[PDB]
Amino acid sequence: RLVQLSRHSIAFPSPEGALREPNGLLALGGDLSPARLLMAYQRGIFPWFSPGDPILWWSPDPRAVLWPESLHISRSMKRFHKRSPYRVTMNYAFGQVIEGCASDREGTWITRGVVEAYHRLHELGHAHSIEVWREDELVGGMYGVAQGTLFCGESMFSRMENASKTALLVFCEEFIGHGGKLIDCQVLNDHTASLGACEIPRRDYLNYLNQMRLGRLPNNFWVPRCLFSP
Amino acid sequence: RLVQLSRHSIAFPSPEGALREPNGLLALGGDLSPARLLMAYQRGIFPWFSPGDPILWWSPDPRAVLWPESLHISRSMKRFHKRSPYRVTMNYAFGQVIEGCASDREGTWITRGVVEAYHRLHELGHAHSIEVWREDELVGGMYGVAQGTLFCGESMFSRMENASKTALLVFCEEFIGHGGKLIDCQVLNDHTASLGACEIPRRDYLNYLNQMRLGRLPNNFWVPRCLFSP
Amino acid sequence: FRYLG
Amino acid sequence: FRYLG
Numbered sequence: 001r002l003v004q005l006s007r008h009s010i011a012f013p014s015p016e017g018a019l020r021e022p023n024g025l026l027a028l029g030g031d032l033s034p035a036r037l038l039m040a041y042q043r044g045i046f047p048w049f050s051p052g053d054p055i056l057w058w059s060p061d062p063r064a065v066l067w068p069e070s071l072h073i074s075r076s077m078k079r080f081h082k083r084s085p086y087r088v089t090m091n092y093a094f095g096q097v098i099e100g101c102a103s104d105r106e107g108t109w110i111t112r113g114v115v116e117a118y119h120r121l122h123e124l125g126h127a128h129s130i131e132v133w134r135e136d137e138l139v140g141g142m143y144g145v146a147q148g149t150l151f152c153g154e155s156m157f158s159r160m161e162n163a164s165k166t167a168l169l170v171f172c173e174e175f176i177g178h179g180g181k182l183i184d185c186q187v188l189n190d191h192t193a194s195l196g197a198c199e200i201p202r203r204d205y206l207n208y209l210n211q212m213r214l215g216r217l218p219n220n221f222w223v224p225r226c227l228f229s230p
Numbered sequence: 231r232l233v234q235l236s237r238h239s240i241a242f243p244s245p246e247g248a249l250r251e252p253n254g255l256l257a258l259g260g261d262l263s264p265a266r267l268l269m270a271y272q273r274g275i276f277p278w279f280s281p282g283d284p285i286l287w288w289s290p291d292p293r294a295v296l297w298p299e300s301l302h303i304s305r306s307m308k309r310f311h312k313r314s315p316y317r318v319t320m321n322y323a324f325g326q327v328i329e330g331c332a333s334d335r336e337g338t339w340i341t342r343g344v345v346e347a348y349h350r351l352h353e354l355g356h357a358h359s360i361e362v363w364r365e366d367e368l369v370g371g372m373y374g375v376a377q378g379t380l381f382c383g384e385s386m387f388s389r390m391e392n393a394s395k396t397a398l399l400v401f402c403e404e405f406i407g408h409g410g411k412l413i414d415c416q417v418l419n420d421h422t423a424s425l426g427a428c429e430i431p432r433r434d435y436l437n438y439l440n441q442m443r444l445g446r447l448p449n450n451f452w453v454p455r456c457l458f459s460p
Numbered sequence: 461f462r463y464l465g
Numbered sequence: 466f467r468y469l470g
Contacts, residue, residue, distance in 0.1 A: 125449030136263045155463035189465030385468035419470025
């Protein structure tokens with residue numbers, strides 16, 4: 001019940017036809033071109049594969065998700081952020097952020113081809129990054145693909161205590177304050193779960209997707225700017 | 231009133247505290263890290279120093295500026311351009327353009343340190359170049375740092391009569407047609423004045439800057455592409 | 461964020 | 466265009 005993607009066509013098979021185990025395995029092949037990738041997110045699909053393997057496309061059931069408002073924040077994190085040593089920006093250094101993610105340990109799945117593919121979406125205005133700075137040094141951040149009022153988180157990275165939590169916390173506030181509705185996490189992991197991510201039915205997620213992709217945030221919401229300083 | 235910087239902070243003293251003579255000298259030291267430069271431009275500050283000296287940061291008063299739609303084009307240049315022997319592209323060869331400027335001989339105020347620094351800004355999507363081609367050879371061009379609908383001109387270089395002007399004229403056309411509203415020249419020089427640059431108080435510049443830094447041009451405006459081909 | 465597990 | 470004149 002899988003499928004080999006057409007090298008000339010950008011079409012995808014329906015997500016409900018994906019495998020149960022591995023969860024969401026939907027197709028393989030094709031390419032990571034701007035249009036293809038973009039099409040995959042509109043349909044609740046995303047590429048995920050290790051170096052050496054051919055492109056693998058997924059749409060898991062259930063789906064990992066994070067309600068911005070339901071973001072969990074311990075009391076020591078609140079004390080920390082009130083006196084934060086960090087500065088947070090948006091779309092200041094997409095290239096550095098994704099490279100920071102691809103440099104962790106699964107950062108090994110963020111292959112050169114993947115870095116190049118998402119960089120294209122960034123240049124084209126679809127992928128965005130949140131940077132966390134400690135003085136002059138980039139110490140964390142995250143990036144994803146905007147889909148209207150729905151944001152699909154791709155990865156995060158941390159080089160200093162609470163750096164990635166500061167990226168998400170600040171991002172959520174900004175996002176919530178301007179109409180953001182949901183953050184897609186694809187698959188629930190340990191870190192993502194401690195932040196408040198939960199699981200909902202694949203069709204529920206696809207319903208939200210179709211509804212939120214039409215939604216709109218302020219026209220200049222993603223222009224590069226400082227989001228948190230003093 | 232003229233502060234020295236440490237690597238410990240990316241913070242800049244307020245521009246209003248800059249010296250009167252030399253006009254605008256605000257601080258010295260620091261580094262040319264992507265985070266500092268971006269912070270600087272967002273505040274109306276820019277680095278300007280000769281080889282051998284420590285980094286000097288400025289915010290003069292008045293500020294040399296150039297209104298796109300007021301670009302001065304002699305009657306001969308128009309005739310020349312109508313039958314232009316040049317081709318113009320965007321962000322095709324930032325490396326070459328900046329080198330062209332650094333070695334234009336006037337020029338040498340662009341040390342290797344500045345080349346690497348601004349090249350990083352280019353890779354991160356904030357510095358941009360305009361290339362002028364005579365057949366297959368780069369014969370001229372210019373580059374700057376984008377700040378929303380405001381463009382900070384860094385430099386221009388020319389190896390063949392009217393290449394500079396071509397880059398500026400064509401850029402200005404693209405720029406205004408897509409929403410761009412202002413070009414920063416920092417300091418009114420002789421070549422700059424002949425092109426139409428005029429002076430305005432530092433205060434007005436910072437007002438325009440705070441206004442334009444959050445505006446935006448089409449998502450693909452800075453995407454590498456051909457701008458003019460006869 | 462799938463690239464965290 | 467400070468790097469010129």
